[PDB]
Design an enzyme around this catalytic site. Sequence first.
Site, PDB file in Angstrom:
ATOM      1  CG  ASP A 132     -15.899  -2.118   3.484  1.00 25.97           C
ATOM      2  OD1 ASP A 132     -16.908  -2.803   3.209  1.00 25.97           O
ATOM      3  OD2 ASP A 132     -15.077  -1.770   2.611  1.00 25.97           O
ATOM      4  N   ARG A 156     -16.785  -7.934  -0.514  1.00 27.05           N
ATOM      5  CA  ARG A 156     -15.792  -7.337  -1.403  1.00 27.05           C
ATOM      6  C   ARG A 156     -14.506  -6.951  -0.637  1.00 27.05           C
ATOM      7  CG  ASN A 157     -12.790  -4.332   2.870  1.00 28.02           C
ATOM      8  OD1 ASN A 157     -11.782  -4.184   2.183  1.00 28.02           O
ATOM      9  ND2 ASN A 157     -12.888  -3.870   4.109  1.00 28.02           N
ATOM     10  CE  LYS A 195      -3.811  -0.197   2.462  1.00 27.68           C
ATOM     11  NZ  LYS A 195      -5.008  -0.977   2.059  1.00 27.68           N
ATOM     12  CG  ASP A 239      -6.005  -2.894   5.046  1.00 24.64           C
ATOM     13  OD1 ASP A 239      -5.297  -1.904   4.774  1.00 24.64           O
ATOM     14  OD2 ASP A 239      -6.339  -3.726   4.177  1.00 24.64           O
TER      15      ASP A 239
HETATM   16  C1  7FM Z   1      -9.068  -1.875  -4.737  1.00 23.05           C
HETATM   17  S1  7FM Z   1      -7.596  -2.328  -3.846  1.00 23.05           S
HETATM   18  O1  7FM Z   1      -7.713  -1.868  -2.471  1.00 23.05           O
HETATM   19  O2  7FM Z   1      -6.471  -1.939  -4.666  1.00 23.05           O
HETATM   20  N1  7FM Z   1      -7.824  -4.048  -3.915  1.00 23.05           N
HETATM   21  C2  7FM Z   1      -7.360  -4.829  -5.113  1.00 23.05           C
HETATM   22  C3  7FM Z   1      -8.539  -5.406  -5.899  1.00 23.05           C
HETATM   23  C4  7FM Z   1      -8.058  -6.284  -7.055  1.00 23.05           C
HETATM   24  C5  7FM Z   1      -9.110  -7.331  -7.422  1.00 23.05           C
HETATM   25  C6  7FM Z   1      -8.468  -8.557  -8.054  1.00 23.05           C
HETATM   26  O3  7FM Z   1      -8.704  -8.722  -9.255  1.00 23.05           O
HETATM   27  N2  7FM Z   1      -7.652  -9.430  -7.332  1.00 23.05           N
HETATM   28  C7  7FM Z   1      -7.040 -10.593  -8.006  1.00 23.05           C
HETATM   29  C8  7FM Z   1      -5.814 -10.983  -7.169  1.00 23.05           C
HETATM   30  C9  7FM Z   1      -6.147 -10.341  -5.860  1.00 23.05           C
HETATM   31  C10 7FM Z   1      -5.515 -10.549  -4.645  1.00 23.05           C
HETATM   32  C11 7FM Z   1      -5.970  -9.856  -3.522  1.00 23.05           C
HETATM   33  C12 7FM Z   1      -7.058  -8.968  -3.651  1.00 23.05           C
HETATM   34  C13 7FM Z   1      -7.681  -8.774  -4.878  1.00 23.05           C
HETATM   35  C14 7FM Z   1      -7.223  -9.460  -5.983  1.00 23.05           C
HETATM   36  N3  7FM Z   1      -5.313 -10.063  -2.308  1.00 23.05           N
HETATM   37  C15 7FM Z   1      -5.088  -9.165  -1.252  1.00 23.05           C
HETATM   38  N4  7FM Z   1      -4.459  -9.665  -0.179  1.00 23.05           N
HETATM   39  C16 7FM Z   1      -4.274  -8.813   0.841  1.00 23.05           C
HETATM   40  C17 7FM Z   1      -4.668  -7.487   0.827  1.00 23.05           C
HETATM   41  C18 7FM Z   1      -4.428  -6.642   2.017  1.00 23.05           C
HETATM   42  F1  7FM Z   1      -3.860  -7.286   3.079  1.00 23.05           F
HETATM   43  F2  7FM Z   1      -3.662  -5.556   1.785  1.00 23.05           F
HETATM   44  F3  7FM Z   1      -5.629  -6.187   2.451  1.00 23.05           F
HETATM   45  C19 7FM Z   1      -5.308  -7.033  -0.307  1.00 23.05           C
HETATM   46  N5  7FM Z   1      -5.504  -7.874  -1.337  1.00 23.05           N
HETATM   47  N6  7FM Z   1      -5.784  -5.750  -0.497  1.00 23.05           N
HETATM   48  C20 7FM Z   1      -6.260  -5.255  -1.761  1.00 23.05           C
HETATM   49  C21 7FM Z   1      -7.770  -5.250  -1.782  1.00 23.05           C
HETATM   50  C22 7FM Z   1      -8.501  -5.835  -0.743  1.00 23.05           C
HETATM   51  C23 7FM Z   1      -9.901  -5.828  -0.783  1.00 23.05           C
HETATM   52  C24 7FM Z   1     -10.539  -5.219  -1.851  1.00 23.05           C
HETATM   53  N7  7FM Z   1      -9.870  -4.633  -2.873  1.00 23.05           N
HETATM   54  C25 7FM Z   1      -8.509  -4.664  -2.807  1.00 23.05           C
END
Ligand code: 7FM
Length: 250
Positions: free
Chosen positions: A124, A128-129, A38, A142
């Site tokens: 949240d 989705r989260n 991040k 988070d």
């Molecule tokens: C909008 S964002 O916040 O950039 N984002 C990414 C969304 C990508 C969707 C997707 O295709 N993919 C395909 C591959 C993928 C892996 C993950 C999330 C999404 C996707 N894994 C992941 N692990 C840990 C965290 C953290 F530990 F950091 F939470 C995290 N994401 N945070 C990111 C995030 C968590 C919730 C909701 N959205 C987003």
Amino acid sequence: IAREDVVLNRILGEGFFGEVYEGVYTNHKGEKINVAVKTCKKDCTNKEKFMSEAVIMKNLDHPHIVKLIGIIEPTWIIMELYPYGELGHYLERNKNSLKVLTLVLYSLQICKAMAYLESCVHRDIAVRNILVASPECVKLGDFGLSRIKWMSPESINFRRFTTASDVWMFAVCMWEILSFGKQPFFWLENKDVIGVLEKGDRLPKPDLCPPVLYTLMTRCWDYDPSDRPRFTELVCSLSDVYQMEKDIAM
Ligand SMILES: CS(=O)(=O)N1CCCCC(=O)N2CCc3cc(ccc32)Nc2ncc(C(F)(F)F)c(n2)NCc2cccnc21
């Protein structure tokens, strides 16, 4: 953590404060870990909330909340990456193969995370989260972790946001899970939500949902927040539902 130990591979997406990247962190003992990095936009004012939300995550430890690995103090928050991605998408893709025991397990895991937080709130709690760590393990994200169609009546009518309001929101999350990722109140416009709630109407029972669990969701949606179950009670109730569904399944 030193920056040289974290390599960025690709864009993951746009976070609240700035871009989030997929990368690889290599231990001081030299092992490789897939990470989500991040960042903060250079235009940011919030730069302090960004670090202080990271301090909070740094102090949390729970099997069902996303793990912070470290903070490279351009400031990067290094989170563990869960490659299965978001729970909503995972439910939709796997709805032909997922069994109700597993949906109840996800609900119980999130409930334990919430009970822990209660012992902070989470604004949240929604599919989705929530991240899928493995087919039998989910992690609350988070974003929204702090000190409309998801919100309690008092949150809508009076802007109040208590633990009892999080219990409301948690049951909405349960409904999403048992519906395989459908949006709560997709049939309504925002303006219509509260009137429906005030008339005593609620999200309908999802098809796969065990009646006992719907009754539990219904309690969580008690209009009077003082009559809603507490998270500690819900953990016990859900643990009973889970054990029962397990016996029914095998
Ligand atoms: C909008 S964002 O916040 O950039 N984002 C990414 C969304 C990508 C969707 C997707 O295709 N993919 C395909 C591959 C993928 C892996 C993950 C999330 C999404 C996707 N894994 C992941 N692990 C840990 C965290 C953290 F530990 F950091 F939470 C995290 N994401 N945070 C990111 C995030 C968590 C919730 C909701 N959205 C987003």
